Amino acid sequence: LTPQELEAYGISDVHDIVYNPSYDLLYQEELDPSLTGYERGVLTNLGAVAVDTGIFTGRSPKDKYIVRDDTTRDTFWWADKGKGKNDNKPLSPETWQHLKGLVTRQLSGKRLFVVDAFCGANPDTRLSVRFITEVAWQAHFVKNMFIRPSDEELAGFKPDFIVMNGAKCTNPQWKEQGLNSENFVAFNLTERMQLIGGTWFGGEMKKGMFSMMNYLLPLKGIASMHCSANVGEKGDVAVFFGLSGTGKTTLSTDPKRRLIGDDEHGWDDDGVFNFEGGCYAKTIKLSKEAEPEIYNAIRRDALLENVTVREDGTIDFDDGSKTENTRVSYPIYHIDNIVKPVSKAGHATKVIFLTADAFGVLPPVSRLTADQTQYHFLSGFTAKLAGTERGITEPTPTFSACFGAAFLSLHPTQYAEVLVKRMQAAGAQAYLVNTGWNGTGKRISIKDTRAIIDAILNGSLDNAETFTLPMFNLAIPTELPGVDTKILDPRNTYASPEQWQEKAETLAKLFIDNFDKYTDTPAGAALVAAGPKLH
Amino acid sequence: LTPQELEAYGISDVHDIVYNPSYDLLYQEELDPSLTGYERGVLTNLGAVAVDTGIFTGRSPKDKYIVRDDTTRDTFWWADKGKGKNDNKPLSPETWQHLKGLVTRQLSGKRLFVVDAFCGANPDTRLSVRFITEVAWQAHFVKNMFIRPSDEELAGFKPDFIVMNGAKCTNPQWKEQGLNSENFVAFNLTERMQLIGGTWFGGEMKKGMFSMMNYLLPLKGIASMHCSANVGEKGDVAVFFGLSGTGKTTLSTDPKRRLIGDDEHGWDDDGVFNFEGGCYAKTIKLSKEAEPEIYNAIRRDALLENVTVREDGTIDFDDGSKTENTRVSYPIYHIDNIVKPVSKAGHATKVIFLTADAFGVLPPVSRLTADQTQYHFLSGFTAKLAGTERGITEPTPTFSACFGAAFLSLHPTQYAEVLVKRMQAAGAQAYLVNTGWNGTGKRISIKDTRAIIDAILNGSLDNAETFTLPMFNLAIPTELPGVDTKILDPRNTYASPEQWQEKAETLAKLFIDNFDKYTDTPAGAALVAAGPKL
Ligand SMILES: O=C([O-])CC(=O)C(=O)O
């Protein structure tokens, strides 16, 4: 790649270009002792480099902006146009040029790392993305998280999107421009470019492209899903929707299943496919005994983010002092139990919605009807966990449409429409699984949740006998192998069962009020009957 | 024991009776592979059987009821009497007959375990209790926790109280009967009976008899105390009042002192006596290095409850993901440094109130005046630990009258009256010891607290020079061997003494509001002067 080729993007005076850096090169660069500040890396006992990101320990949804122009005006789900809140705040073309100037100036006159990669496992729908950074570890992050092209694919590489990471710069004019802060994560779908200013959080470099796939794929009838995905020995695929920290990484690395992916998937005529080339796993409280596949992926070429490293070089995975949202990224082949040669398989037969219910009202597991599936997908009731977005310090209940509202570029109903079409063609059954808390105020045990997933995936619940929870009208299995029957009814863990009724009424009303905005069509109005009902 | 004898309690068609089974038989019965559900027992690598009680990981005070009849109407400290918060909820005789029928039908038509035992080490005041269960490990629990009679004592054993464990049954009529849930822990002082319904937590089988002793003993001038107790070489006894998990087990373990007991004691004309035959110890975070004596009691004939047992049979004592209130019970002789063969000694001369102060206000040690002894006994400021009662999941500050409000059948002042009488006759001195937290937000170190107990027990503080903490007016020793003098004043862990005053006045207000219910008598009104003064 030529300096002039990067001059097309507005960068000037490019010194040297480190194109498609190898893992060996990134390792040496990351340990260079001349690095300062948030560029510095340290080597841990496990052989993986660890970095820190300052206060930027989670995403910055309040600094997310999309240029409103002829490409996006009539197609985007805008933060200032709908009944439903979202983070897609409109940006003017003039202000975009100002932000782009800040970033290109910052990346000018410097040695730059350039990573070309794919978002999307399938050539017919993938984005070719060119990432530009001045920091080796940020280049390493995107080499891990996106799909690494072959040499032949590189020779003919034509980028569809450019991502420029200018974490080291900020926008001093932000107040007068009506922006939220001196930081920015900005998208222009006409120039096909993402800018990062101020924030060093690794996730910003992957969830931008997820948002772009969430724009392009549902318009072509392909579902675009915030879920993990795995497959059984017989080719049966399951997808697990949820926010990070609510169980989708942990439940998807099941030893009885083979991993398709961690976080971002599409569903087309052939099946369920991963967008990513790696996994960005939460490491708080990680242990070798509890998560052996993930723990073993932490070795050279993994990249640890905000973990506490002792003076002797060992990692204290239990220490959330910099943040609870500690992370590691690794290329997906650091897990042996994965689908190869491409991260994809056939249609999903099981759809699992993970809800971290902080009210302790919902059952550990419920088998949803078809209408309840749409109702609960649009609702997206769960919790934001500490650190996942800046400013979140404790589990925060939320209605996150499609279990991923922060990444939606289209209206929630457009994701629901495609998901339902694909589920119906497959005969897929959906389940609502509470990975949050119960009446004891304690978190539901991962041992119980894994046993529940086992029972879902082997088909044993599809026709099992059930009872119905009042108010929510959720069908609960009467018994489940490997789990204390008494915990299946969320009422039993209450010292006084009337307290369940009270909290359930409260949560039922939150659901009804949240769902009202989806009832402006006959189809949406008809789903109210599948939601919770007050007496 | 014959079937006819149990049919007198209302049980029908009794098949086999397993009467006072040995420890060896109970081990065989608990490992029967045909057992399902909460009945199942597994063997750990330490040789102790472990059981799991599901969602019943602590006491159920909201399910505790006492029949209100001619025996109890005028004497019990009822929950609806308007004289302070308590769990003594009244039950009608009619609803009692319904609950009893649920349990007796549940126990009918099957093999029963019967354990006869004593509550109280002295024959003159002890209850003879007969426990009936359909689960071997529940019989094991009571074999551990109550006093195991000799063959001669079983010969003419005559029950004073019957405890029926019907954990496997529930009450479907609970809503219309005005009860809290389908579970129940119910007491009838006229029939002299306890019923257990629905809940499998072992401690329900011991704290019910504690509540009965707390009724019967103070009415005849015998103190009934939620405390641990031990005795030195000279015969001097100490009692440590407090809630479980706030130091009474740990601090009574002391090479200079033989253990009398862990949790429940009486104090009569002859001295201090354990009610129990064993210990029900909290095991969260237990380690051999930190609690060697308790750890070494976990072996065959102990009974682990809700501890995590791995697939290889090892125990993960640190895992609180199900509950922090993991427990083990063992007969007391699993501790070597004990008073034997009877768990009793003379009069106490040192009385230690343990307060787990979550606000970092109170001194690690204060020497109380006579009026302060009553004021702080009645206030019972401390904290309830996670899991000890259902629904508690973090340290919870509480005013637990007499350091055991959950078990008081009479008004708090009746326990204070008898305690003061015994202390005064014995020349006893009281100390208030903070086992909780200091200004920094960290917990007071056990090493400091152990040095404090040493200094109390050898009499070195009784005449030592003191200074006075303001507001609470607490006499603090000016120095103390084995602790850095810095720690004795609770202000020193605050940036400024004004920052302490801030916290202190907040807590003092809670003390004053909590004590006001005691001020309708001249004596109670006079005690306000011994409390904190804003
Ligand atoms: O998945 C979410 O909800 C957030 C996240 O991981 C990311 O930041 O990359």
State which amino acid sits at residue B389. Answer: E
Residue positions counted in chain B: 534
Comparing alpha-carbon positions, the chain B residue that sits nearest to A491 is B181
Regarding the beta carbon of A329 and ligand 1, being less than 6 Å apart is answered no
| HSE toward the beta carbon, residue A226, CA cutoff 13 A | 31
Q: Is A533 a catalytic residue?
A: no
Regarding the beta carbon of A59 and ligand 1, being less than 6 Å apart is answered yes
The CA distance from A272 to B161, in Å, is: 67
Contact B393 A442 (CB under 8 A): yes
| HSE toward the beta carbon, residue B390, CA cutoff 13 A | 26
Q: Is A69 a catalytic residue?
A: no
The CA distance from B433 to B356, in Å, is: 9
Name which of B322, B326, B392 to mutate to probe chain A: the one with the most chain A Cβ atoms within 10 A of its Cβ: B322
Nearest Cα to B30, choosing from B1, B12, B46, B52?
B52
E strand residue ranges, B413-473: 429-434, 466-469
Residue A307 CA to ligand 1 centre (angstroms)? 17
Comparing alpha-carbon positions, the chain A residue that sits nearest to B59 is A495
Helix ranges (H only) for B120-179 are 136-145, 151-155
State which amino acid sits at residue B251. Answer: L
The CA distance from A129 to A404, in Å, is: 22
CB B293, CB B337: distance < 8 Å: yes
Nearest Cα to B261, choosing from B279, B246, B244?
B279
The CA distance from B228 to B246, in Å, is: 11
Q: At a CB cut-off of 8 Å and minimum separation 6, what does B443 contact? A: B436, B437
Quote the minimal CA–CA distance from A366 to chain B in Å.
20
Contact A484 B322 (CB under 8 A): no
**Helix H or strand E segment including A145:** helix A136-145
Handedness of CA A455, A457, A463, A468 (dihedral sign): positive
Quote the minimal CA–CA distance from B406 to chain A in Å.
16
Largest CA distance in chain B: 73
Question: What is the count of residue pairs from A and B with beta carbons less than 8 Å apart?
Answer: 36
Among the partner-chain residues A439, A445, A495, the one whose CB lies closest to the CB of B322 is: A445
Catalytic residue among A59, A282, A390, A411: A59
Name which of A445, A492, A496 to mutate to probe chain B: the one with the most chain B Cβ atoms within 10 A of its Cβ: A496
Residue positions counted in chain A: 535
- The pick from A64, A263, A392 for probing ligand 1's pocket by mutation, whose C-beta has the most ligand atoms within 8 angstroms, reads A263
Residue B97's Cβ-count burial label (10 Å; 0-12, 13-18, 19+) is middle
Residue extent(s) of CATH 2.170.8.10 domains in chain B: 37-57+278-335
The CA distance from A325 to A319, in Å, is: 10
Residue B191's Cβ-count burial label (10 Å; 0-12, 13-18, 19+) is middle
Regarding the beta carbon of A244 and ligand 1, being less than 6 Å apart is answered yes
Instruction: Retrieve residue A479's tokens.
Output: 């018994």
Name which of B390, B394, B396 to mutate to probe chain A: the one with the most chain A Cβ atoms within 10 A of its Cβ: B390
The CA distance from B225 to B407, in Å, is: 10
Class of domain A222-277+338-532: alpha beta
Contact B393 A494 (CB under 8 A): no
Q: Is B329 a catalytic residue?
A: no
Which phi and psi (to 5°) does residue B107 adopt?
-90, 0
Closest atom of ligand 1 to A203 CA is 9
Distances (CA, A) of B286 to B260, B293, B316, B327, B354: 22, 11, 9, 10, 21
Catalytic residue among B59, B64, B265, B376: B59
Comparing alpha-carbon positions, the chain A residue that sits nearest to B308 is A447
Nearest Cα to B189, choosing from B161, B148, B230?
B161
**What is the end-to-end Cα distance of chain B in Å, rounded?**
63
Comparing alpha-carbon positions, the chain A residue that sits nearest to B57 is A440
Handedness of CA A232, A233, A236, A237 (dihedral sign): positive
CA B115 to chain centre: 21
Nearest Cα to A429, choosing from A374, A517, A350, A344?
A350
The CA distance from A414 to A437, in Å, is: 31
Handedness of CA B219, B225, B231, B236 (dihedral sign): negative
Regarding the beta carbon of A206 and ligand 1, being less than 6 Å apart is answered yes
Q: What does DSSP assign to residue A364?
A: S
Residue extent(s) of CATH 3.40.449.10 domains in chain B: 1-36+62-221
The CA distance from A150 to A153, in Å, is: 5
Q: CA A278, A284, A287 angle in degrees (round to 5)?
A: 85
The CA distance from A313 to A44, in Å, is: 5
Quote the minimal CA–CA distance from A494 to chain B in Å.
7
3-state DSSP of A426-456: HCCEEEEEECCECCCCCECCHHHHHHHHHHH
CB A278, CB A23: distance < 8 Å: no
Comparing alpha-carbon positions, the chain B residue that sits nearest to A490 is B55
CA B103 to chain centre: 26
Q: Is A116 a catalytic residue?
A: no
Quote the minimal CA–CA distance from B130 to chain A in Å.
29
Burial B272-305 (b: 16+ CB within 10 A, else e): bbbbbbbbbbbbbebeeeebebbbebbeebbbbb
Instruction: Retrieve residue A104's tokens.
Output: 């290109």
State which amino acid sits at residue A383. Answer: A
| HSE toward the beta carbon, residue B56, CA cutoff 13 A | 24
The CA distance from A216 to A210, in Å, is: 10
Among the partner-chain residues B54, B60, B321, the one whose CB lies closest to the CB of A495 is: B60
CB B63: neighbour CB atoms within 10 A? 26
Bond preceding residue B341 cis, omega within 30 of 0: yes
Quote the minimal CA–CA distance from A277 to chain B in Å.
34
Nearest Cα to A323, choosing from A367, A266, A386?
A386
Q: Is A409 a catalytic residue?
A: no
The CA distance from A440 to A275, in Å, is: 39
CB A67, CB A96: distance < 8 Å: yes
Contact A440 B180 (CB under 8 A): no
Which phi and psi (to 5°) does residue B23 adopt?
-55, -40
**What is the end-to-end Cα distance of chain A in Å, rounded?**
67
Instruction: Retrieve residue A80's tokens.
Output: 């200032």
Pick one of 1.10.3720.10, 2.170.8.10, 1.10.1200.10, 1.10.10.10 as the CATH number of B37-57+278-335.
Answer: 2.170.8.10
The CA distance from A486 to A440, in Å, is: 13
Residue A427's Cβ-count burial label (10 Å; 0-12, 13-18, 19+) is exposed
Q: Is B226 a catalytic residue?
A: yes
Q: Is B263 a catalytic residue?
A: yes
Closest atom of ligand 1 to A404 CA is 3
Contact A495 B322 (CB under 8 A): no
Catalytic residue among B104, B249, B366, B382: B249
Instruction: Retrieve residue B218's tokens.
Output: 């103070």
The CA distance from B153 to B121, in Å, is: 13
Residue nearest to atom 6 of ligand 1 (CA): A244
3-state DSSP of B57-76: CCECHHHEEEECCCCCCCCC
Q: What does DSSP assign to residue A529?
A: G
Question: B1-36+62-221, what's its fold?
Answer: Phosphoenolpyruvate Carboxykinase; domain 1 (3.40.449)
Q: Is A344 a catalytic residue?
A: no
